[PDB]
Design a binder for this molecule. Structure first.
Ligand code: ATP
Ligand code: MG
Ligand code: MG
Lengths: 51, 385, 380
């Protein structure tokens, strides 16, 4: 059962379009961080609930 | 020693006390959410869907529209909607624009770049004043240009003379030039910016001149300040050659800094510490006094100077009280203060090979032979003929 | 010994935790600009946000064909048309346009080019300096009056002689000669506008972007009346060629070229004076130096003994000095050098007096300051 589950999970992860990588330039008190998203320009963007 | 212990006791009850206070004080239950806060909050979430793609405000036209360039090659003629005052916004400001429709939702940026943060190095100077074994006379030339208008403006004001602009440190390495730099920095408690001049040597197009402008902006914002352009000569007189793409860059960077050092007038509130090995046998690029004022040549250490430096070091050593201090310094010719520092370090290393935990009475007379011989070889002076 | 070692070890941990606790302090409180009554503005703002007329993608007419052929900045061409009603006569080659995201129609013609706005930040208006407190009695000071003031104040005499009105002056001198200082003084007195251009700042390049800026700025000038365009430090970029190098470069030849041709041949001018600041004429491309670009060149001549007593006096007034102090004697001992060297001597004389714990600088102080500066320059 677990193997059938495993192959499926591998399938579902790959779907995700985009997915990048920035660097936290500075931190502000607005539940945000200014990030220079590296392939793109800059984005000031809110934090996810997890971090 | 003891003086240091007295302080530890106070520092450890200050931190403790603060930390405990802080919980309550910050909030944890205080939770301001009364009418003034609630307003701000509600609005901010509504208006701002995120991510928010920043712009630069190029011009205003009075009709609550602005013209901004976004990071996209198409620019966008935008509405100003909500938050930030029209007046408060002046052209050249960087701005937050809303991603669905580009509108001025505020500013919180002020042309924040990572470059400014990197440069910004106010952080704890490792030197306090006169921890150094240097001579009173050398430090009290740097102090005269830099300290003395901030501590006593009365005398400068009364005379009517302008406060000096800049100094140049040059020696002779092993005179502790950068030690001197961070002795000064501690006393003033000024925003102490630092940038190294090789970061302004690159093949990258026009980047040198952009960096040069940043430096003047930074200092002025965070004034009173000391700007350490360390190895100023990296940009200037010192080379990286021109058969490497350098026939473009080096010219443009040298000129650019030169032009801003004179400016329309000397700022007279930004102190500079300019480091360079010496500009005696190098070309001069630090363009005449009045923009660099007093120029400071540190002496090569004489016999009395190295006595003072030597006293620091002998304190930790045990069995150097029987050793006559005076005769070690004399016998050696006048040489760097670095060479006395080298000797102390070698001395301990050498005791260990003899097998004695700290120096033996014998170890110290021996130490001098190994260090003097090594250093005279490294640096040979003209032989008398 | 040993029980007091462990007092150091404890200390260090504490200091580090306090610093991280700063983040917690800042908290989560968010508040943005727009106090007093600009948050009541935001309530109007909300419905108009959902509303649509903003943004407009910006493009530029590259040809009007009686619809219009627009070219966007991503580089992509479309034939479009008028939106609500956009007169034919408004849309011209080079004129920006506001067009809709995707319905691609002109709403408003927009003023031509976004590049003037960028460069208008650099521009500084009519600086002010008083000609009387301009140090020296320099000959140079006088020839500036001929170039700038006299054609503006009385253009009649020039017509009558049937000479061309002087309009070009090239300033060069060692640093500290006072090139910037005298230009600001004659800007003020003649009561003519001023345009600050700094050529050292040009770096925006795409093979000939630097040439666009320069044509626009010079043209801005023509539109203006009674004006000065002061290109500062044209020693490099629009100064020297970097062709000479092994791999070489010619983004600087583009910028240089454009300037030469605007100056050279027919081209209207609205009483445009051309001031050029080069530290040395040597660095300056010979193309510019030789005539038909800038009309006049003056080699700055270092101030006379009378002019050097004169700069010193300016400084000495700012100072608190001894009565009967011999300005002239101090000056004579001093080298024939810039107004700069003299500024420095008064600066150090002040300081040695302060150190010595005096509020009035003695004659003797300035004997010391002099000895200091001579040696400096020499040793290098
Ligand atoms: N006529 C003068 N009287 C008094 N001091 C003078 C005079 N001219 C220049 N100086 C002094 O020289 C210094 C610089 O003057 P200024 O900025 O005009 O220089 P410049 O020759 O235009 O130089 P750069 O090569 O840096 O562009 C200042 O300290 C100023 O007081
Ligand atoms: Mg060092
Ligand atoms: Mg100048």
């Amino acid at each position: 059962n677990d193997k059938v589950r495993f192959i499926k999970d591998e399938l579902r992860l790959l779907q995700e379009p985009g997915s990048y990588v920035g660097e936290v330039i500075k931190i502000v008190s607005d539940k945000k961080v200014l990030v220079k998203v590296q392939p793109e320009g800059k984005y000031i963007v809110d934090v996810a609930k997890d971090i | 020693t003891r003086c240091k212990l007295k302080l530890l006791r106070m520092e450890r009850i200050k931190d403790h006390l603060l930390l405990e206070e802080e919980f309550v004080s910050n909030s944890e239950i205080l939770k301001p959410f009364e009418k003034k806060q609630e307003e701000e909050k509600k609005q901010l979430e509504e208006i701002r869907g995120n991510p928010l793609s920043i712009g630069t405000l190029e011009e205003i036209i009075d009709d609550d529209h602005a013209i901004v360039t976004s990071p996209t090659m198409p620019d966008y003629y935008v509405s100003i909607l909500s938050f930030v005052d029209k007046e408060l916004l002046e052209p050249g400001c960087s701005v937050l624009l809303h991603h669905k429709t580009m509108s001025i939702v505020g500013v919180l940026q002020d042309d924040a770049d990572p470059m400014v943060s990197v440069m910004k190095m106010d952080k704890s100077p490792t030197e306090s004043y006169s921890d150094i074994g240097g001579l009173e006379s050398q430090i009290q030339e740097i102090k005269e240009s830099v300290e003395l208008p901030l501590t006593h403006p009365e005398l400068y004001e009364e005379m009517g003379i302008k406060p000096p602009k800049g100094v140049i440190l040059y020696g002779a390495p092993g005179t502790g030039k950068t030690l001197l730099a961070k002795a000064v920095a501690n006393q003033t408690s000024a925003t102490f910016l630092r940038i190294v001049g090789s970061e302004l040597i690159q093949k990258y197009l026009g980047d040198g001149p952009r960096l040069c402008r940043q430096i003047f902006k930074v200092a002025g914002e965070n004034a009173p300040s000391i700007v350490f352009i360390d190895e100023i000569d990296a940009i200037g007189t010192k080379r990286y050659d021109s058969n490497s793409g350098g026939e473009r860059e080096i010219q443009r960077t040298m000129l650019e800094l030169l032009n801003q050092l004179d400016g329309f007038d000397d700022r007279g509130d930004v102190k500079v510490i300019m480091a360079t090995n010496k500009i005696e046998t190098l070309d001069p690029a630090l363009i005449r006094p009045g923009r660099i004022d007093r120029k400071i040549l540190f002496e090569n250490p004489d016999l009395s100077t190295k006595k003072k430096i030597l006293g620091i070091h002998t304190s930790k050593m045990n069995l150097s009280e029987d050793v006559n201090l005076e005769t070690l310094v004399t016998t050696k010719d006048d040489l760097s203060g670095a060479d006395i520092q080298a000797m102390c370090t070698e001395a301990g290393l050498l005791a260990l090979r003899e097998r004695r935990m700290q120096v033996t009475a014998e170890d110290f007379k021996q130490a001098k032979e190994r260090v003097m011989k090594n250093k005279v070889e490294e640096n040979l002076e003209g032989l008398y003929l | 010994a040993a029980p007091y070692a462990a007092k150091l070890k404890q200390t260090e941990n504490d200091l580090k935790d306090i610093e991280a606790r700063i983040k917690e302090k800042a908290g989560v409180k968010e508040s943005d600009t727009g106090l007093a009554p600009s948050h009541l503005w935001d309530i109007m703002g909300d419905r108009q946000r959902l509303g649509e007329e903003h943004p407009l993608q910006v493009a530029r007419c590259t040809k009007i064909i009686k619809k219009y052929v627009i070219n966007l900045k991503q580089i992509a061409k479309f034939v479009v048309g008028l939106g609500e009603r956009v007169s034919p006569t408004d849309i011209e080659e080079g004129m920006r346009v506001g067009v809709d995201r995707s319905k691609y129609n002109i709403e408003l013609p927009l003023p031509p080019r976004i590049d003037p706005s960028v460069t208008m930040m650099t521009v500084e208006e009519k600086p002010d300096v008083t000609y009387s407190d301009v140090g020296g009695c320099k000959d140079q000071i006088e020839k500036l009056r001929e170039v700038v003031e006299l054609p503006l104040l009385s253009p009649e005499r020039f017509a009558t002689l049937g000479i061309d009105p002087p309009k070009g002056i090239l300033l060069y001198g060692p640093p500290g000669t006072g090139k910037t200082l005298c230009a600001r003084a004659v800007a003020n007195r003649t009561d003519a506008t001023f345009i600050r251009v700094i050529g050292s700042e040009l770096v925006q390049k795409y093979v000939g972007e630097g040439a666009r800026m320069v044509r626009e700025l010079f043209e801005m000038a023509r539109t203006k009346k009674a004006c000065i365009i002061f290109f500062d430090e044209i020693d490099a970029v629009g100064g020297a060629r970097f062709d000479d190098g092994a791999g070489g470069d010619n983004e600087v030849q583009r910028t240089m070229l454009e300037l030469i041709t605007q100056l050279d041949g027919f081209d209207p001018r609205g009483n445009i004076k051309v001031m050029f600041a080069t530290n040395r004429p040597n660095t300056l491309d010979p193309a510019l130096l030789r005539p038909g670009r800038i009309d006049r060149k003056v080699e700055f001549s270092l101030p006379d003994l009378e002019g050097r007593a004169n700069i010193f006096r300016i400084h000495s007034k700012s100072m608190s000095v001894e009565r009967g102090i011999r300005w002239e004697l101090i000056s004579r001992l001093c080298p024939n050098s810039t107004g700069a060297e003299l500024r420095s001597v008064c600066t150090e004389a002040g300081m040695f007096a302060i150190r010595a714990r005096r509020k009035v600088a003695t004659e003797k102080d300035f004997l010391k300051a002099v000895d200091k500066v001579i040696s400096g320059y020499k040793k290098f």
